[PDB]
Design an enzyme around this catalytic site. Structure first.
Site, PDB file in Angstrom:
ATOM      1  N   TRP A  66      -9.198   6.540  -0.483  1.00  0.00           N
ATOM      2  CA  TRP A  66      -9.367   7.192  -1.654  1.00  0.00           C
ATOM      3  C   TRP A  66      -8.486   6.733  -2.803  1.00  0.00           C
ATOM      4  O   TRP A  66      -7.401   6.339  -2.592  1.00  0.00           O
ATOM      5  CB  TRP A  66      -9.355   8.825  -1.349  1.00  0.00           C
TER       6      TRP A  66
ATOM      7  N   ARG B   9       0.134   4.691   2.931  1.00  0.00           N
ATOM      8  CA  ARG B   9       0.137   4.296   4.448  1.00  0.00           C
ATOM      9  C   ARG B   9       0.629   5.468   5.345  1.00  0.00           C
ATOM     10  O   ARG B   9       0.639   5.211   6.525  1.00  0.00           O
ATOM     11  CB  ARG B   9       1.086   3.022   4.674  1.00  0.00           C
TER      12      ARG B   9
ATOM     13  N   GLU C 186      -4.848   4.130 -10.664  1.00  0.00           N
ATOM     14  CA  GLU C 186      -5.770   2.816 -10.352  1.00  0.00           C
ATOM     15  C   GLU C 186      -6.842   3.086 -11.471  1.00  0.00           C
ATOM     16  O   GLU C 186      -7.013   2.109 -12.307  1.00  0.00           O
ATOM     17  CB  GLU C 186      -6.313   3.041  -9.120  1.00  0.00           C
TER      18      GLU C 186
ATOM     19  N   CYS D 112       0.933  -1.214   0.186  1.00  0.00           N
ATOM     20  CA  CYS D 112       0.072   0.066  -0.082  1.00  0.00           C
ATOM     21  C   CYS D 112       0.932   1.356   0.029  1.00  0.00           C
ATOM     22  O   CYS D 112       1.740   1.427   0.988  1.00  0.00           O
ATOM     23  CB  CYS D 112      -1.059   0.093   1.104  1.00  0.00           C
TER      24      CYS D 112
HETATM   25  C1  HEM Z   1      -6.305   6.690   1.851  1.00  0.00           C
HETATM   26  C2  HEM Z   1      -5.650   6.727   0.813  1.00  0.00           C
HETATM   27  C3  HEM Z   1      -5.122   5.335   0.252  1.00  0.00           C
HETATM   28  C4  HEM Z   1      -4.606   5.171  -0.813  1.00  0.00           C
HETATM   29  C5  HEM Z   1      -4.263   6.465  -1.786  1.00  0.00           C
HETATM   30  C6  HEM Z   1      -4.048   3.926  -1.188  1.00  0.00           C
HETATM   31  C7  HEM Z   1      -3.238   3.449  -2.129  1.00  0.00           C
HETATM   32  C8  HEM Z   1      -3.182   2.056  -2.607  1.00  0.00           C
HETATM   33  C9  HEM Z   1      -2.905   1.699  -3.815  1.00  0.00           C
HETATM   34  C10 HEM Z   1      -2.852   2.424  -5.185  1.00  0.00           C
HETATM   35  C11 HEM Z   1      -2.737   0.261  -3.778  1.00  0.00           C
HETATM   36  C12 HEM Z   1      -2.493  -0.840  -5.181  1.00  0.00           C
HETATM   37  C13 HEM Z   1      -3.985  -1.346  -5.250  1.00  0.00           C
HETATM   38  C14 HEM Z   1      -3.836  -2.112  -6.598  1.00  0.00           C
HETATM   39  O1  HEM Z   1      -2.793  -1.675  -7.295  1.00  0.00           O
HETATM   40  O2  HEM Z   1      -4.755  -2.917  -6.735  1.00  0.00           O
HETATM   41  C15 HEM Z   1      -3.065  -0.292  -2.432  1.00  0.00           C
HETATM   42  C16 HEM Z   1      -3.122  -1.412  -1.946  1.00  0.00           C
HETATM   43  C17 HEM Z   1      -3.524  -1.720  -0.549  1.00  0.00           C
HETATM   44  N1  HEM Z   1      -3.873  -0.967   0.336  1.00  0.00           N
HETATM   45 FE1  HEM Z   1      -3.790   1.160   0.135  1.00  0.00          FE
HETATM   46  N2  HEM Z   1      -4.560   3.195  -0.091  1.00  0.00           N
HETATM   47  C18 HEM Z   1      -5.236   3.704   0.790  1.00  0.00           C
HETATM   48  C19 HEM Z   1      -5.973   3.565   1.830  1.00  0.00           C
HETATM   49  C20 HEM Z   1      -5.843   2.051   2.162  1.00  0.00           C
HETATM   50  C21 HEM Z   1      -6.465   1.694   3.591  1.00  0.00           C
HETATM   51  C22 HEM Z   1      -7.682   2.698   4.543  1.00  0.00           C
HETATM   52  C23 HEM Z   1      -6.366   0.568   3.883  1.00  0.00           C
HETATM   53  C24 HEM Z   1      -6.721  -0.593   4.883  1.00  0.00           C
HETATM   54  C25 HEM Z   1      -7.146   0.059   6.250  1.00  0.00           C
HETATM   55  C26 HEM Z   1      -5.422   0.194   2.798  1.00  0.00           C
HETATM   56  C27 HEM Z   1      -4.978  -1.352   2.588  1.00  0.00           C
HETATM   57  C28 HEM Z   1      -4.215  -1.944   1.459  1.00  0.00           C
HETATM   58  C29 HEM Z   1      -3.978  -3.164   1.307  1.00  0.00           C
HETATM   59  C30 HEM Z   1      -4.028  -4.138   2.033  1.00  0.00           C
HETATM   60  C31 HEM Z   1      -3.512  -3.236  -0.118  1.00  0.00           C
HETATM   61  C32 HEM Z   1      -2.865  -4.484  -0.877  1.00  0.00           C
HETATM   62  C33 HEM Z   1      -4.028  -4.895  -1.717  1.00  0.00           C
HETATM   63  C34 HEM Z   1      -3.630  -6.120  -2.331  1.00  0.00           C
HETATM   64  O3  HEM Z   1      -2.627  -6.860  -1.925  1.00  0.00           O
HETATM   65  O4  HEM Z   1      -4.404  -6.624  -3.261  1.00  0.00           O
HETATM   66  N3  HEM Z   1      -5.084   1.074   1.969  1.00  0.00           N
HETATM   67  N4  HEM Z   1      -3.128   0.942  -1.762  1.00  0.00           N
HETATM   68  C1  LIG Z   2      -6.483 -11.827  -9.113  1.00  0.00           C
HETATM   69  N1  LIG Z   2      -6.738 -10.635  -9.944  1.00  0.00           N
HETATM   70  C2  LIG Z   2      -6.622 -10.355 -11.206  1.00  0.00           C
HETATM   71  C3  LIG Z   2      -6.246  -9.421  -9.139  1.00  0.00           C
HETATM   72  C4  LIG Z   2      -6.731  -9.518  -7.614  1.00  0.00           C
HETATM   73  C5  LIG Z   2      -6.591  -8.258  -6.729  1.00  0.00           C
HETATM   74  C6  LIG Z   2      -5.856  -7.343  -7.459  1.00  0.00           C
HETATM   75  C7  LIG Z   2      -5.311  -5.936  -6.534  1.00  0.00           C
HETATM   76  C8  LIG Z   2      -6.805  -5.660  -5.938  1.00  0.00           C
HETATM   77  N2  LIG Z   2      -6.396  -4.874  -4.773  1.00  0.00           N
HETATM   78  C9  LIG Z   2      -6.870  -3.520  -5.046  1.00  0.00           C
HETATM   79  C10 LIG Z   2      -7.199  -2.311  -3.709  1.00  0.00           C
HETATM   80  C11 LIG Z   2      -6.804  -2.670  -2.638  1.00  0.00           C
HETATM   81  C12 LIG Z   2      -6.798  -1.855  -1.543  1.00  0.00           C
HETATM   82  C13 LIG Z   2      -6.862  -0.605  -2.003  1.00  0.00           C
HETATM   83  C14 LIG Z   2      -6.795   0.627  -1.081  1.00  0.00           C
HETATM   84  C15 LIG Z   2      -6.930   1.998  -1.636  1.00  0.00           C
HETATM   85  C16 LIG Z   2      -6.936   2.137  -3.057  1.00  0.00           C
HETATM   86  N3  LIG Z   2      -6.812   3.639  -3.404  1.00  0.00           N
HETATM   87  N4  LIG Z   2      -7.057   1.043  -3.744  1.00  0.00           N
HETATM   88  C17 LIG Z   2      -6.920  -0.057  -3.414  1.00  0.00           C
HETATM   89  C18 LIG Z   2      -6.949  -1.078  -4.400  1.00  0.00           C
HETATM   90  C19 LIG Z   2      -5.397  -7.288  -8.792  1.00  0.00           C
HETATM   91  C20 LIG Z   2      -5.568  -8.288  -9.711  1.00  0.00           C
END
Ligand code: HEM
Ligand SMILES: CN(C)c1ccc(CCNCc2ccc3ccc(N)nc3c2)cc1
Ligand code: HEM
Ligand SMILES: CN(C)c1ccc(CCNCc2ccc3ccc(N)nc3c2)cc1
Ligand SMILES: C[C@H](O)[C@H](O)[C@H]1CNc2nc(N)[nH]c(=O)c2N1
Ligand SMILES: C[C@H](O)[C@H](O)[C@H]1CNc2nc(N)[nH]c(=O)c2N1
Ligand SMILES: [Zn+2]
Lengths: 411, 407
Positions: free
Chosen positions: B278, B109, B283, B106
């Site tokens: 947000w 963070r 994305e 993330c």
């Molecule tokens: C507040 C603004 C936030 C921004 C700008 C942000 C940004 C991002 C971005 C760009 C990703 C990549 C997701 C993707 O490419 O699919 C991500 C992943 C992730 N975010 Fe953050 N996030 C935010 C808030 C949060 C919050 C509130 C949480 C949890 C309480 C969180 C937990 C996670 C987790 C666990 C991932 C990994 C997702 C995965 O492994 O598929 N995020 N975040």
């Molecule tokens: C299995 N596949 C196709 C696949 C599954 C999950 C993903 C990533 C999904 N995680 C999206 C994600 C998770 C947490 C977020 C928190 C904040 C934010 N702005 N975007 C966020 C976006 C990508 C590909």
């Protein structure tokens, strides 16, 4: 054991068995991934198994494994090792080795070309003047008036570690960098330390923005010597933009031949500490990294000013807009001057095909995602979506410390 | 055993000690790096509870106190007795915030400590879940001034009474496979959409249809609910230069709210824990709009720009990509919906990294995910070495419910 990798865009799943042949370490453990870390004298003891592993590979590749020629070669190498503490590769083995080091280079997106590599055997070389001659010939051959050809020149292998051949330049052709008293830099900031060494060694610097550096060449563990590459052998391309006429006035150019000269080539336990090689550029190496890295020429602002972009807020993506036009300009300029170059779309598309071919015919293809994915427009290239497995095969190219940090000066 | 990471643009070097407290495994070995792979009992439970309570009580400067030992034996008694235990509100909030803090993938963070935690452990029914989710959505959306939040449903018991949100995000667009062979709407959601349909959803078979919630309470069969449209803030996408852009008919929703992950705290498992923050602009503009297996609109946009699409070397894809992402950021900002650009976000993350190294001894980070999907090396994170390791509390992936559900 079988390992699978998936392309999440095509759903193509591949099976890796090749990783089983890996012996060298990655840096990672079960508890930590070091995938984004840039960089995470040998006895007859360890030498014969390394020799034997290599010769088994070589003889398999030519479908002569277990042949009398194979067995006699192992015998011959064993005796040469135990009586002389090292051994000499045949020309065929050397060529095979160099191609395979390229083939195994997990950070190289250009490996579809690995089997087309011109190997120049310079193991009879003894002096720096000798090295200079070989390097000129390499540059002339590889440049080929713009129709670039991949090549590598291989100088004598390490012996006791006290008689190393080394090319002190990081690339055969590179622009000088000069630190100014006001803290600013003229030329390429990446090359300031090396530039200072050359100057100290007696180089007369023109002190401009694009001064081709002299060669600093070390033969047989002796102090390195300075040589100027004949300017007529250095092909350069003035950078212009197909639509923006002010672009030429930025005064940009670049050289055509990327020729890395500071890596170590390992084949069959033997170490070639001087093995300069060259292919051709992917456009982003110049347009993204060389021009737009903050720690390099750093031209993004000047370009964005000239395009009259809104530079008050990053959310205008002025940097992203300027970056693209610069990369368009690099590609346009090289193509217009008929110098070989590949854009990152073409290059990554070819890499996917290569990688699929390698899985089929070889059981694998070690690939370092962090380096394979281009430095702009990542996810609109197919490699971004490709899972990859990184492991280390030999023969290989390795980093080695900069020679000024280890060289024992003779005077 | 003590590890250094370097930033090659600024020469800043950080030393990591935090990885030594790591517990789970990476998928990597000494012989193979898997960094680019997307998905690499009472006796088990008490050390887990213990590890968590230790860090909890250490964070409030009461390590080795009477209350620490007291809590430790109380949870211990509760585990021997009930085979599980319940977190105090303070421990639940700490755990959720730290799960986010520990999310190596993330980039956002820096905000980790400002998370609104909604305790929904008293929930028993899918209607109950619906209510809590609408409240979450309304709270987080905040008329466009987004606030980070998580809603935590009851923990796993015997795995037969799981709470699950079947949606991958609270708000997402439907995907329908055509007789024309192509795909209408979001291809990522074709399978989930079908499950809604075979469960009873009456689809409008449009391009941007907000999917209905499929909610599973207490291991029961999931039920459909439509989120009140009035709570679903959406943004028409226009360009601040290209008048024809609005004609593409693109829009997106303001609230990214991930609903399919598993929250693990102190050995306890929360299978339903939707959270939201947000968007980072890429994305939507890069991934959602330009991925080949998504809305895949690059060609159409390029044509409208009249670019030379004959040769890849004209970099028309790259030109179009930038303009699309300009439109996205422009549209959200114009409508006053919180969004961050990839430059601002990565710059924030570098500052967060240095904070965490300075105050915590490290920051687990997954470079492959942290580096944005466009303009990689013009953002600071590209030049930043990162160490990836697994800390708990954590958000984990878990299997899609329909493959697991004993209907
Ligand atoms: C507040 C603004 C936030 C921004 C700008 C942000 C940004 C991002 C971005 C760009 C990703 C990549 C997701 C993707 O490419 O699919 C991500 C992943 C992730 N975010 Fe953050 N996030 C935010 C808030 C949060 C919050 C509130 C949480 C949890 C309480 C969180 C937990 C996670 C987790 C666990 C991932 C990994 C997702 C995965 O492994 O598929 N995020 N975040
Ligand atoms: C299995 N596949 C196709 C696949 C599954 C999950 C993903 C990533 C999904 N995680 C999206 C994600 C998770 C947490 C977020 C928190 C904040 C934010 N702005 N975007 C966020 C976006 C990508 C590909
Ligand atoms: C023929 C066209 C070629 C293309 C388009 C190409 C492309 C690239 C690119 C873009 C990189 C990343 C370099 C960086 O970002 O610093 C790279 C790395 C590398 N290439 Fe290739 N390459 C080519 C030929 C070769 C040849 C001929 C060799 C050796 C015989 C080679 C061996 C390597 C090695 C060892 C690396 C890793 C460098 C490092 O770790 O610093 N490549 N290649
Ligand atoms: C010490 N630093 C900052 C540093 C040193 C080397 C690197 C990587 C250099 N790799 C250059 C390289 C190697 C082989 C190549 C083959 C072909 C090609 N077109 N470019 C190629 C470029 C990055 C950072
Ligand atoms: C820290 C990070 O590993 C470093 O910046 C890497 C990232 N990926 C790269 N990829 C390529 N091709 N070349 C590079 O120099 C780098 N640098
Ligand atoms: C194969 C590769 O791991 C996959 O495409 C990853 C790459 N990096 C990513 N980074 C982010 N932030 N999100 C993603 O979905 C992905 N996908
Ligand atoms: Zn790894």
């Amino acid at each position: 054991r079988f390992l699978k990798v998936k392309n999440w865009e095509t759903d193509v799943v591949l099976t890796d068995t090749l990783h089983l042949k890996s012996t060298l370490e990655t840096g990672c453990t079960e508890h930590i991934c070091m995938g984004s870390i840039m960089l995470p004298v040998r006895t007859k003891d360890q030498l014969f198994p390394l020799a034997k592993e290599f010769l088994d590979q070589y003889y398999s590749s030519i479908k002569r494994f277990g042949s009398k020629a194979h067995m006699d070669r192992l015998e011959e190498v064993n005796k040469e090792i135990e009586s002389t503490s090292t051994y000499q590769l045949k020309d065929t083995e050397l060529i095979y080795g160099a191609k395979h080091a390229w083939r195994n280079a997990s950070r190289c997106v250009g490996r579809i070309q690995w089997s087309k590599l011109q190997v120049f055997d310079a193991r009879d070389c003894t002096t720096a003047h000798g090295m200079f001659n070989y390097i000129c010939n390499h540059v002339k051959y590889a440049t080929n008036k713009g129709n670039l050809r991949s090549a590598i020149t291989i100088f004598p292998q390490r012996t006791d570690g006290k008689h190393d051949f080394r090319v002190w330049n990081s690339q055969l052709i590179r622009y000088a960098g000069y630190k100014q008293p006001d803290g600013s830099t003229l030329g390429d900031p990446a090359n300031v330390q090396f530039t200072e060494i050359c100057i100290q060694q007696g180089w007369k610097a023109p002190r401009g923005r694009f001064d081709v550096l002299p060669l600093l060449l070390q033969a047989n563990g002796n102090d390195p010597e300075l040589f100027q590459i004949p300017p007529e052998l250095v092909l350069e391309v003035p950078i212009r933009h197909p639509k923006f006429d002010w672009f030429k006035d930025l005064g940009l150019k670049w050289y055509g031949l990327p020729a890395v000269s500071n890596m170590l080539l390992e084949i069959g336990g033997l170490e070639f500490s001087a093995c300069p090689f060259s292919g051709w550029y992917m456009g982003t190496e110049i347009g993204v990294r060389d021009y737009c890295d903050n720690s390099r020429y750093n031209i993004l602002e000047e370009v964005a000013k000239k395009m009259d972009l809104d530079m008050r807020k990053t959310s205008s993506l002025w940097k992203d807009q300027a970056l693209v036009e610069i990369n368009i300009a690099v590609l346009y300029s090289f193509q217009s001057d008929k110098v070989t170059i590949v854009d990152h779309h073409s290059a990554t598309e070819s890499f996917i095909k290569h990688m699929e071919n390698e899985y089929r015919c070889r059981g694998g293809c070690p690939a370092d995602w962090v380096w394979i994915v281009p430095p702009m427009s990542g996810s609109i290239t197919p490699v971004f979506h490709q899972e990859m497995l990184n492991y280390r095969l030999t023969p290989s190219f390795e980093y080695q410390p900069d020679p000024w940090n280890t060289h024992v000066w003779k005077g």
